[PDB]
């Protein structure tokens, strides 16, 4: 497909792209509680989230694409430390402006966030 609901691409094809500095399987978590097997792909300036299309092996929606420069907070839950929340927007001395929030349950929470954090800086 070119679009199913969003843009459809081939997960492998993307993983091997030169831009890709990192890659992390996970599941996006919705407020509704549903979870969606995905792959966070990290570049030197962006972080994509490819949502696996179950019925079409090896294909994913391009579910989102955020600029590392727009990441302001990254938290893990205490009760469940592999549940990583990403908070996007603007940050200054007075406080924080939250424009978007993505939540992923990430297998190697520690390694992943450390990789992303290293990119962010």
């Amino acid at each position: 497909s070119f679009m199913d609901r969003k843009e459809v691409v081939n997960i492998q094809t993307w993983i091997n792209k030169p831009d890709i500095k990192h890659h992390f399987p996970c599941k996006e978590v919705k407020e509704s509680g549903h979870m969606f097997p995905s792959h966070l792909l990290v570049t030197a300036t962006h972080m994509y989230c490819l949502r696996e299309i179950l019925s079409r092996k090896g294909l994913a929606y391009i579910q989102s694409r955020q600029a590392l420069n727009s990441v302001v907070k990254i938290t893990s839950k205490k009760k469940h430390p592999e549940l990583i929340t990403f908070k996007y927007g603007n940050s200054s001395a007075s406080g924080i402006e939250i424009l978007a929030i993505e939540r992923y349950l990430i297998p190697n929470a520690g390694d992943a966030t450390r990789a992303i954090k290293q990119q962010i800086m």
């Binding site: 938290t75 839950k77 940050s91």
Partner: peptide, 12 residues
């Protein structure tokens, strides 16, 4: 309740 892992302006 959560743990800050990164917070732009503060944890660098």
């Amino acid at each position: 309740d959560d743990n800050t892992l990164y917070h732009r302006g503060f944890t660098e």
